[PDB]
Each structure stands twice: as C-alpha cells, then as structure tokens.
Amino acid sequence: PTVKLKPYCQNIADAATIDSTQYPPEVVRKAEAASIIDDPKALEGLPDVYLEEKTINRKNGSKIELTITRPLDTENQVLPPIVFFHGGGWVVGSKLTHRRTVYELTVRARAAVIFVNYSLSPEVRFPTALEECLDAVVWVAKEENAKSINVDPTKLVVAGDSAGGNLSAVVCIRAKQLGLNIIKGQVLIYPVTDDNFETDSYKQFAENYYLTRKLMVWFFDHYIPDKKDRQSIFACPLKASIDDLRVLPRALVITAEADVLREEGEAYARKLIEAGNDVTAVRYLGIIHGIFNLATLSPTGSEILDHIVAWLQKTWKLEHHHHHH
Amino acid sequence: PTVKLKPYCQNIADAATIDSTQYPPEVVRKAEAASIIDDPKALEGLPDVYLEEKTINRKNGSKIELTITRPLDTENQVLPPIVFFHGGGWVVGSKLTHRRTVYELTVRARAAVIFVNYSLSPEVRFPTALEECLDAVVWVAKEENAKSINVDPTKLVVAGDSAGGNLSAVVCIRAKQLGLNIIKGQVLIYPVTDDNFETDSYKQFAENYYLTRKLMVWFFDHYIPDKKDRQSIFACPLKASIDDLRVLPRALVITAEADVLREEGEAYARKLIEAGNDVTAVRYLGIIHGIFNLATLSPTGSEILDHIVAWLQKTWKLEHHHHH
C-alpha cells in the first residue's frame, strides 16, 4: 500500500529542507535550539511543571546532569519515576527539543520525569552515554536518593525515543547483566536497534520522511566510528540472542509506519516476545519519525502519549499488587 | 518478516478446530455457546457489574433487545454510553461470547455499555442488522431515553469488533446521510470493510489463524447472498469515495498483525485520513483475530482495552472542552 501521512507529519516531512550532515555537530545543535526558541507555537499550550536541575557526582569527580520535572502541587507527594532518554541520533537533542514531550508526559502521567542530559557524540563515543544513563537509573533506584527527590523506586520505568529508545533497551539489558531488578518497565518509541541500512523500511523511506538513511549513517559514524564495535549488543540490541534478552522488563514498543527504523524496531519486539517477555508492540499508521523532538506535538503524538500513560498506569498497578505498599 | 505470535494467540491458533462451514448456523451457535459455558474459566475473575435488560420497540413493530452493563454503585450517576456491536461474521456471536470483553470495558471505562443483540444471518440479511443498530443509537441519543438509563448522550460512542466493527463504521456513515450528529466517536476493532478475499493479508493468513478465508466467505454468503448488494458502501465501507467519508466521527481503528482482515482495516483507516478525519490507526503485533469473543481475555486483549479506554477518555474530554 502507498503511505498516506497525516497532515502534520506531511508538513514536517516537506519542511525538512537543510542537510545537517554538511555541518559540524555544534552548529547543528545551535540551529536546532534556535528552531525551537524561534517557533511561535513553541510555548502555546505548554503545561506548567515544577522543574529542578540536579547534579549527581560520581566517584572521581565527574557529573551527570539530571533535569527533573513534576506536576505542580505534588510537593509532598511520592511519584513514580520515569527516567527518560532523548533521541537525536546520539549527536543532537536536548531538554529543549523534548520539552514539549517531557512536560506533557509529566502532567499526563503525574510522574517525576527524570531527564538524563547524557554526553553527546562525537565529543564522546559509544559507550559513554550508555554508562551515564545506567548510572542515572542506578542512582534513582537507590532508596535514600529516591527519598531525596520524592519518587518511589518500586515504580521506576525507563523511556526514550529514537536513539533514546536504543539507550532504554540497552540500559535494560545491561542492568540485567549486573543482576539488578530495579527497572520495572521499558518504553521504546521508534527505537534504533540495528545498523542494517538496507532493511525494507530503510529502502522505502530512505528519503523525504524527515529521518533519512543519510542522517542515520551520519549519526552512527559519529557514535561508533569503527564498524566492528557495532557488533556489540549494547550498540545494536537486535543482534542479541534470545537468551541474552530473557527476563527483561515489561515492554512497550511503538513504531511508525513511515520510518526507516520501522522494521528493526518491530523485529526487536518479535525477539523480545520469543524471549518470553511481557511485550506490547504497536505500529501507528500515517506517522513519521521525529514527532517527539519538536516545538509542538502532533495530534497523533498526543494520542500516543495517552496510550503510553495508560500502559504505564497498568504497569504500576501490577507492581502495587503484589505489594510494595 | 515472519510473524511471531504471542503464546496465548499461538495456542488459540494451534487448537483442534471443526469446520463450521459444514454445519447449519443454528448448530454453530449452540456449539459456540456451549464452548463458553463449559469453560471452567469463563466465570473466574469476571468483573461484577450492574446489568439491566431493555427492549426497544422499533417503528415497524420489531424489537431490539439491549443488554446494558454499568459499574456497581452507579445506579444514580450519569455515565457515558458506549453502544457496542459484537462480532461473529453477522451469523454468530452473542452477549455470552463477548461477556468477558464487555464486562471488562464496562468497569475499565466506567461507562454504560449498551450491547445490541441485533438479528443474525441467514435468518435476516443485510441490511436488517444495520437498521437495528442505527435505531439503537438513535434511541440512546434521544434525551428522555438517555435520562431513563442515566447516560450522557453528548458522549455517545459506537464500538465493535470484526463484523461489529463493520456495523460501527457503516452506522456512522448512515447517520451522516440522515443528517444526524449523535455519534461522537467510533472504535473499530479489526473490522470487516471489504469483500476482496485476495488481499495480501487474506493470502498470508488464509488458514491456521483461527479466523479463516473460508469462514469469511461463508459469513458473506449468509449476510449478503445477492452479490450486487456487496457494492453498497453500507456493506463494504472501503468502497466509499473520499468525499463520502468526510466529517465522520473521531475514529480509533485497531488491526491485528496476523489476520486476514488486516489490509482492508488499514486501507479503511487511510481513506478516513484522506477524508480529513480525526483517525488513530494502530496495528498490534503478534496477535490474531478473535481475542475479544472468547471465555477469557488474552494479555494483549487486556492491554488493548486499556488503550481503548484511554482513547475514549480523551474523546469525552474533547467533547466537553468548550464548556470553559
């Protein structure tokens, strides 16, 4: 069938009219920031949140920067924590590009969203960001830390979009390998899971749908320069064996119909199912990649967030019984 | 890619099956009912609900039996109404086969679910059921009727699975033609939308996925014997023009990955998008058709109901929005 995009996503697809691969990453990031600040709709209907900037200090003196958002009037309430990893191909993206998505998730889920400002590539390479994210989850799951930011570590979930979905997936595999049972759910929004740039979705949507093959290649080349390293399952979790993926957290995998990453996201969901996990995998029709890193939120983006919230609410209900509490 | 079914759906798919197309419909129905009753789990973990049975007297002297379920302690609370059309290929299905699904929707959405026991085929043909379902929606939307069963007609949504998805869709189109503005949303769960038995999903899942191409042909044969009538958009709404499908109610279209009807459901969603409607279309991976007409509810079935409920709540909020 021929893809019929929804109006918003069509608009975005045609709007993308500049090659970021021709510029240095700092320039691209500054242009991105400007495109958010200069969007006249960027602040319209933006929910109000209580925001806190938090630094966690590692052993040697290094820092992980966390941005924590929560609904207003939750000052003495303990909330479920959502540790969020943003997309941007490991090279761009920020609390600003994902402000819309994060503020909406915060007030719809009534959760503390813990946004990890991880180190971007190429200034660092794989696996530095991954280790920062794992360290952030480990920090949040620790009882005294969770008390300090009024969240309930028994409801911790990881969530992320695109390259952030990759990070969510592999942080889960990694925590499993360290014998930790601290992540209760993973939400993967059109994740990067492999480096095969000739899957059918890659062929069909290689150009003119905002996220391009060219851009994916550029991202991978900055993140993992030496191609052999791409064989690590912590880079490309689709290459993992079924046994590698057993006993992972309850998962929601969301894919876009018109997206180069569609096939690998759906194949990763099939592998998670083979491995006996609790997996919900859904493809949304008529949308493209990138609806969650913009100044505004498409109608379908909003439906998707309502879905994610319903699923999170079920996840937390599952926990609450058999009690913790 | 090769389809990976989830365990529950795999087991359902692998099960010992009898060719229903070899038996008369009435026998199929009694056997179906028996299949629900003799399941020891059909009643275990079933939500408790307040149930009321209501008869509609149609203008032509025939009756529609309505089964209305709402949550306990809601006798004197006004609730949103969901008018529900069950699946079964227009030939089978009942308040019993969908009891599990309906009770769960009832307590999860905390809504009044109005289950239409419409007349089955071949005892009647197209379009008798469609006419009954439309009359049921008009009845609920009528203010004194809505007040009598404590529902808020400003939130009326239609919902249906399979052939019941078909009915939901076309009821909307019919209501549009009659200039009625009483449906605020439509939920189409892997709906029948066309009669092309040779789409890609029909070919790929023709056998061994519970719902078969054989069974669909049998269904269409009982529902619409005279093939000329299959050209009606009220039989196959996929055949409607884009202009025909304009300004329909806000829609949620859910398809199953391993299902013969997958392609036409998704094609109908694309047409609804082309026509400028508010449409959410989702394909759930690793499942088959028919998870909503059984004694139990699969894990994915449960997730899907949670999805629908979230979507319904957004629908109900959008409708009440201007009251501010």
Author numbering:
A (entry chain A): 3 to 327
B (entry chain B): 3 to 326
Tell me, in the authors' exact words, what the paper reports.
The monoclinic space group of RmEstB was C121 with four molecules in the asymmetric unit. The substrate-binding pocket of RmEstB extended ∼11 Å from the protein surface to the catalytic residue Ser164. Esters with acyl chain lengths longer than C4 therefore hardly bind to the substrate-binding site due to steric hindrance. Phe222 and Trp92 are located in the center of the substrate-binding pocket, close together (4.1 Å). Structural comparison and mutagenesis analysis in the present study indicated that the side chains of residues in the substrate-binding pocket create a steric hindrance, thereby potentially altering substrate specificity in the esterases; moreover, residue Phe222 played a vital role in RmEstB’s variation in substrate specificity.
We recently characterized two novel HSL family esterases from the thermophilic fungus Rhizomucor miehei: RmEstA and RmEstB. Both of these enzymes belong to the α/β hydrolases and exhibit distinct substrate specificities: RmEstA shows highest activity toward longer-chain esters, whereas RmEstB favors hydrolysis of shorter-chain esters. A classical catalytic triad consisting of Ser161 (Ser164 in RmEstB) as the nucleophile, His292 (His291 in RmEstB) as the proton acceptor/donor, and Asp262 (Asp261 in RmEstB) as the residue stabilizing the His was identified in RmEstA (RmEstB).
